[PDB]
Scaffold this active site. Structure first.
Site, PDB file in Angstrom:
ATOM      1  N   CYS A 147       6.759  -0.417  -7.440  1.00  9.84           N
ATOM      2  CA  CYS A 147       5.591   0.385  -7.008  1.00  9.84           C
ATOM      3  C   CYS A 147       5.762   1.108  -5.648  1.00  9.84           C
ATOM      4  O   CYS A 147       6.670   1.927  -5.468  1.00  9.84           O
ATOM      5  CB  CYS A 147       4.321  -0.485  -7.009  1.00  9.84           C
TER       6      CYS A 147
ATOM      7  N   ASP B 274       5.512  -0.677  -2.242  1.00  6.19           N
ATOM      8  CA  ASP B 274       5.392  -1.748  -1.274  1.00  6.19           C
ATOM      9  C   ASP B 274       6.730  -1.869  -0.551  1.00  6.19           C
ATOM     10  O   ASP B 274       7.778  -2.115  -1.167  1.00  6.19           O
ATOM     11  CB  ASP B 274       5.025  -3.047  -1.952  1.00  6.19           C
TER      12      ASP B 274
ATOM     13  N   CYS C 138      -0.327  -2.231  -0.667  1.00  4.36           N
ATOM     14  CA  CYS C 138      -1.738  -2.463  -1.017  1.00  4.36           C
ATOM     15  C   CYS C 138      -2.389  -3.492  -0.103  1.00  4.36           C
ATOM     16  O   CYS C 138      -1.757  -4.052   0.775  1.00  4.36           O
ATOM     17  CB  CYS C 138      -1.868  -2.886  -2.483  1.00  4.36           C
ATOM     18  SG  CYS C 138      -1.489  -4.623  -2.800  1.00  4.36           S
TER      19      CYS C 138
ATOM     20  N   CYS D 185       3.047  -9.077  -4.792  1.00  7.88           N
ATOM     21  CA  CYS D 185       2.917  -8.749  -3.378  1.00  7.88           C
ATOM     22  C   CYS D 185       3.060 -10.016  -2.520  1.00  7.88           C
ATOM     23  O   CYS D 185       3.295  -9.949  -1.316  1.00  7.88           O
ATOM     24  CB  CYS D 185       1.591  -7.995  -3.102  1.00  7.88           C
ATOM     25  SG  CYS D 185       1.387  -6.289  -3.848  1.00  7.88           S
TER      26      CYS D 185
END
Ligand SMILES: Cc1ncc(COP(=O)(O)O)c(C=O)c1O
Ligand SMILES: Cc1ncc(COP(=O)(O)O)c(C=O)c1O
Ligand code: FES
Lengths: 378, 135, 377
Positions: free
Chosen positions: B29, B31, B54, B98
């Protein structure tokens, strides 16, 4: 401070008042042959005419659906299936809502040939693609009036000339009805998609408008309500509400959109002072209610949640807020996956005030600074 | 959504860069994250972090660095994605990667610190050979 | 005196009280990643569970629709299209709602072989026809739980047993929720249709319950809500009302049912005691709310509008009122001659029906019939 109006809108108090008696006292079914059903029919009929009147739709029919999504499904699948004897080629815009893009993808599995129309850096369709790829076998072309993510208004009047009554023209007016003039004869539409909630009526209802003669296959089969085109006992209360919203939008839309434009501009002029910020979508041929900015070095969901903790509602096209893919619109404009992450979408509506903006513009710069100061990328 | 995740996101612990850092670890993504550690007597005397990602990225990076601060190195290598997921009060699926993010940046920081101070032997000790190669 | 509860019911006031905030105060979209999204998201899931709790739906999934109609479209079309490679043979009852009979007819057009299960005199599906015609390539059976037209309750427990592992079982439960016990595990439903308005929640929303690991193709395509089976921005208020009504129907039906059965019974004893009255559908195994008798000496719409004029909202299977001008498919299937069936009265009872309402119809009806057959060809 709610700046997320294009994801949901509240129901206008005056619409609610129109709706409530249909839910408890005049709850008759239009198909019934007695007093209760007759009242019910007058009500649906009045609503039908208020929706048609809203878009200058006398030379065509309103079909009530459960929303813009169904309406779109019906426009695309309904029309193509019934009309496949006259060709099977279809043009669709690359920036359409997924309730257009997915149905076209279904037709692709059913021996239809669909070409998706590219756009430019600001998200306007390329009209000369349309004129270049139009063929004697093309039967349908679907383009939105305006884009609810980047705010960009499309060359639909231009598109209507090129087509020249040689292929049916679908227009999703979900983003435009209430923001800018929506006149089906002026824009030469054969089918029009309208959303109730987008004009402050109840959620879960909408219409497809269909020019007289345009013939369609239904999608929802059963009782044969909506003249055979959509079955199910009619959701009278919502339809009335939808109708009351149309009447209000007709009378109030111009002054409202002029006000929202003025607030839109103050936002854009202030937001864009921030180091490394960019407007997405056209800077002028743009819905009065749309601000879509991006911020280098940071990610959109974070901006969105930061804002929320201040009491500010907003939206993002970041991958992080879905799927896990960014906004198909942003990709089509030709944003890189990096650029699309720092997206902020603020969309305006009827209950916004100068004070909402005050609050936004004193909060934002501190947010962008706080996130930036942690980004490995700054 | 998640409870103390809000508190580490809005009020994050140990944000910054460390000059003459003793170990710098860094990671589908959008990150990206680095951890910086200074190490005194086999301890993390200081830890600062920088991440782009995020709200859960932010939250986990915060929690992870709070968990490792002032701890022995072997005590820190005990900070798996789950000890940090749990630490906050858990996280929902999809955003759980995450937590893997933070626990990995910290491992790498520690693995950085060994590769710079000739402590390649401990790298083996100790379970972390695979992550040196994939770096 | 409203006796047309199965055509449309009023929304319950408590349902309403629970709907409003989500129209004005908490109007957010469940996809939004902010507080207004979050509230709406908790509000939706709580309703989904209240609906699952209604029909005993833990071993499955609730999918929100715009109503029964769509839910049946989803059950038949979406299940048959996604499962076709297991076989293309389908069994549909001859008295299903048209929202099940039409999509099946769509399927016949698409190459599927659909067979229609016959019924006896009281409109009860032949469980034997289902035994001997169920092939190796049968993938879907569709049998309503009850008929809203004539009141008959189908043998779904026993049908579910005739199957067992073979074909998935679709049951339209529109007539039945709030009326008689509806338990997915007990009737052995692989799919189940639920109507909000039918249980005093709002019009414009309904559901398909779907057992865990039954797979369907979606009908409404787009944004991926309802986990990819029904796109479109959630009608949060409607879904809330739907849940609220689900919560009352769980806590009130046993009794309201008794009350109505009593009223139905009174109605049953007196109407039947009239010149040339027959009772359509099963007299005993029948929803607490269905009186539907036929008269030889008259036409249906007449009996209906003649009632409207006394202040009585009723319904008819009379061909006259059908816009296509044909008589009830449900009645033809029982075996009635198109002529015999023309003059039928249907009386759907409900929540706000009282004794005095019932005593009015009994003081009005006899004259309506007599001073009407008094002018007959
Ligand atoms: C058994 C049955 N199924 C489906 C329906 C369809 O309900 P709606 O028309 O509200 O979708 C009805 C009522 O009309 C019904 O009685
Ligand atoms: C351009 C456009 N079309 C269609 C829709 C479909 O809306 P709904 O999810 O209410 O069916 C949306 C979203 O509101 C939209 O922005
Ligand atoms: S998005 Fe990789 Fe939290």
């Amino acid at each position: 401070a709610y700046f997320d109006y294009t994801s949901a809108k509240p129901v206008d108090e005056r619409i609610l008042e129109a709706m409530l008696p249909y839910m408890t006292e005049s709850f008759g079914n239009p198909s019934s042959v007695h007093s209760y059903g007759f009242k019910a029919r007058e009500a649906v009929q009045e609503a039908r005419e208020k929706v048609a009147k809203l878009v200058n739709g006398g030379g065509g029919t309103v079909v009530f659906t459960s929303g813009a999504t169904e309406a779109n499904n019906l426009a695309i699948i309904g029309y193509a299936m019934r009309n496949a004897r006259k060709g099977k080629h279809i043009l669709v815009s690359a920036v359409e809502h997924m309730s257009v893009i997915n149905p076209a993808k279904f037709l692709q599995k059913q021996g239809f040939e669909v070409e998706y129309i590219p756009v430019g850096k600001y998200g306007e369709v390329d009209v000369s693609f349309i004129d270049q790829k139009l063929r004697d076998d093309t039967i349908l072309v679907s383009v939105q009036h305006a884009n609810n993510e980047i705010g960009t208004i499309q060359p639909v009047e231009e598109i209507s000339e090129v087509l020249a009554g040689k292929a049916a023209l679908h227009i999703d007016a979900t983003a435009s009805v209430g923001q800018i003039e929506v006149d089906v004869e002026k824009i030469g539409a054969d089918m029009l998609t309208i959303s109730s909630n987008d004009i402050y009526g109840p959620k879960g209802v909408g219409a497809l408008w269909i020019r007289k003669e345009a013939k369609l296959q239904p999608v929802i089969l059963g009782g044969g309500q909506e003249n055979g085109l959509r079955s199910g006992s009619e959701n009278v209360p919502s339809i009335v509400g939808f109708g009351k919203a149309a009447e209000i939008t007709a009378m109030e839309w111009r002054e409202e959109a002029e006000r929202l434009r003025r607030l839109r501009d103050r936002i854009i002029d202030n937001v864009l002072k921030i180091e490394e910020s960019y407007l997405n979508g056209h800077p002028e041929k743009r819905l009065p209610n749309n601000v879509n900015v991006r911020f280098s070095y940071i990610e959109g969901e974070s901006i969105v949640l930061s804002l929320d903790m201040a009491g500010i509602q907003a939206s993002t096209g970041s991958a992080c807020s879905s799927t896990l893919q960014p906004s198909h619109v942003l990709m089509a404009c030709g944003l890189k996956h990096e650029e699309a992450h720092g997206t902020l979408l603020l969309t305006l509506g009827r209950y916004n005030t100068d004070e909402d903006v005050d609050r936004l513009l004193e909060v934002l710069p501190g947010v962008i600074e706080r996130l930036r100061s942690m980004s490995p990328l700054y | 959504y998640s409870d103390k995740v809000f508190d580490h996101f809005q009020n994050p612990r140990n944000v910054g860069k460390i000059e003459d850092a003793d170990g710098v670890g860094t990671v589908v993504c959008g990150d990206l994250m680095t951890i910086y550690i200074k190490v005194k007597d086999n301890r993390i005397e200081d830890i600062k972090f920088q991440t782009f990602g995020c709200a859960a990225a932010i939250a986990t990076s915060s929690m992870a660095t709070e968990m490792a601060k002032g701890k022995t190195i072997e005590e820190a290598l005990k900070i798996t994605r789950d000890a940090v997921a749990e630490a906050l009060g858990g996280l929902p699926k999809q955003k759980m990667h995450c937590s893997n993010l933070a626990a990995d940046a910290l491992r790498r920081a520690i693995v950085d610190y060994f590769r710079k101070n000739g402590k390649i032997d401990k790298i083996k000790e100790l379970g972390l050979e695979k992550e040196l190669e994939k770096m």
